[PDB]
Amino acid sequence: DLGKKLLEATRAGQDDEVRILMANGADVNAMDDAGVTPLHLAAKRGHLEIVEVLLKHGADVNARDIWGRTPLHLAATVGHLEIVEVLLEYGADVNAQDKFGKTAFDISIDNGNEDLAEI
Amino acid sequence: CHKIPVEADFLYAYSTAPGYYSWRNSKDGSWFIQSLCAMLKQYADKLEFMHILTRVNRKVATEFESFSFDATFHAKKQIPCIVSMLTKELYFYH
Amino acid sequence: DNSYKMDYPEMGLCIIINNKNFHKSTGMTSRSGTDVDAANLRETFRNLKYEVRNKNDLTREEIVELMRDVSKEDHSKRSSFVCVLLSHGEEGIIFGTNGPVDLKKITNFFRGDRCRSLTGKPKLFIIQACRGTELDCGIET
Numbered sequence: 001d002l003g004k005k006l007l008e009a010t011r012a013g014q015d016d017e018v019r020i021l022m023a024n025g026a027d028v029n030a031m032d033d034a035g036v037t038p039l040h041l042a043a044k045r046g047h048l049e050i051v052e053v054l055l056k057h058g059a060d061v062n063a064r065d066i067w068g069r070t071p072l073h074l075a076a077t078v079g080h081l082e083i084v085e086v087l088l089e090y091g092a093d094v095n096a097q098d099k100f101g102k103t104a105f106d107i108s109i110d111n112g113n114e115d116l117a118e119i
Numbered sequence: 120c121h122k123i124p125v126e127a128d129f130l131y132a133y134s135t136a137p138g139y140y141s142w143r144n145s146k147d148g149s150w151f152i153q154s155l156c157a158m159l160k161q162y163a164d165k166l167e168f169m170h171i172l173t174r175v176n177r178k179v180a181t182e183f184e185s186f187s188f189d190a191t192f193h194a195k196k197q198i199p200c201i202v203s204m205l206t207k208e209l210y211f212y213h
Numbered sequence: 214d215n216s217y218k219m220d221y222p223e224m225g226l227c228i229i230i231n232n233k234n235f236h237k238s239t240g241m242t243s244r245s246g247t248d249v250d251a252a253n254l255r256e257t258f259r260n261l262k263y264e265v266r267n268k269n270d271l272t273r274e275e276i277v278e279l280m281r282d283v284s285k286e287d288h289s290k291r292s293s294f295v296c297v298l299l300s301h302g303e304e305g306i307i308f309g310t311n312g313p314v315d316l317k318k319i320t321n322f323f324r325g326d327r328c329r330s331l332t333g334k335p336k337l338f339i340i341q342a343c344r345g346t347e348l349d350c351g352i353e354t
Contacts, residue, residue, distance in 0.1 A: 011188050033144055033185055034192035035242060041188055064242045066140055066192060067346055096240060099346045123333065125325040131338045137304060138345040148249035149341050152299070156257040163261060184351070196351035205217075209293075209335050211261055213219035 003030030010038035010054070013047045018054075028057045035065040043071035043083050051075075051083050061090045068098035076104040079113045088119070126204055132172060133200040142185055142197050151199050154178040159211075168209035172201045217335050218292065225291035225334075227263035228283055229254055232300035234270050236311045247299050250341065254297055263295060273309030277318065284322035288330035294323065295337045302342025316340070 006026040009017040018038075022028065031037055039059040042050040051071075055061060062070050072092040075083040084104075088094070097103055108116040134151035135141040143149040158174045166174070176199050185195040231251040235241035255265045268279060280296075288294065296319075301308040305316050325332045 007188050031145065031245070032187045032189075032192075033142060034187040034189060036187055036189045036192065044189070064240070065189065068240070123325060125327075127325060128332075128334060129320065129323070129336045129338065131320075131340060133344065134341045135344055136349075138347045139343070140346055140348055141302070141341060141343045143244065143246050145245040146249070148246045148253060149299075152250040152253060152339075152341050155339065156253045159257050159261065181354075192348070194351065196349040198349065205335060207217045207335075208215055209217050210219065211224075213216060 002026035043075040076107040131202040221292040225293040227258040227295040
């Protein structure tokens with residue numbers, strides 16, 4: 001399954017392999033059983049260019065894992081400003097709450113990230 | 120006159136223990152319903168219902184483990200939860 | 214006797230509520246693979262001679278209305294009752310497409326005193342739904 005390999009390549013940060021897989025028709029919104037998508041992985045692992053190529057090809061900006069977390073939540077946790085901005089440009093929902101009632105703004109406060117809280 | 124409780128003769132077969140997430144697979148379905156259907160197909164003519172549900176518990180407990188590219192969600196386990204207010208044995212072949 | 218009477222003319226109803234898609238306002242994900250469950254359950258219970266009724270994507274109000282209506286049917290010729298719930302959940306809660314339903318409210322319709330044609334008969338609720346977000350880390354065998 002190409003969708004598994006995409007998730008795999010995205011996690012490892014293989015930007016080229018990500019592009020090759022998508023060209024072969026790999027589902028950009030592929031999921032593991034925890035609802036983790038390539039966009040979740042790219043946001044968490046800080047792979048900016050991969051985040052951008054997934055979103056360009058229609059990655060669900062507001063996909064939720066089994067804890068209700070969006071890529072915006074995960075980007076906020078590690079504090080990747082550029083990914084947060086790119087996610088926001090593609091219509092990421094700042095008001096989205098995980099199953100624990102936390103927003104991306106709430107994570108930025110808990111991490112002590114002043115630069116992220118204002119954005 | 121003789122009575123029974125209004126809550127008697129209910130069975131609640133939960134996929135998972137109280138407080139826990141319940142795992143599903145996109146192609147095969149949920150772990151619990153897979154196992155329930157498989158155990159009913161194999162044992163509905165052989166075992167009482169509680170014993171069928173116990174095979175389901177073991178099947179879910181031993182044969183399934185989560186796979187996730189996020190370590191937070193990886194290698195997780197699941198036990199179903201049989202809740203019986205039944206007053207009799209249940210055999211589907213009667 | 215030790216065993217439920219199962220030689221009534223009919224085995225009974227098997228009501229399957231299959232919620233796959235949820236209102237945007239809820240923020241709840243699509244339940245991929247639930248159709249596989251629903252089809253698997255119908256095959257399994259129809260082979261057990263149950264009268265299978267599948268309902269897809271029901272709101273919280275529709276779930277309650279359905280269960281009220283089903284509990285008010287004549288079950289006197291039926292050996293048992295089965296209801297299968299496939300949805301998102303929380304402890305004590307099943308989700309309609311538009312929000313939470315209290316599981317107790319659903320099952321109360323079938324109480325011994327409220328559904329008289331099922332008094333003394335097994336009422337089986339099969340609940341495929343989260344009961345929280347807790348994850349079992351497991352332990353080596």
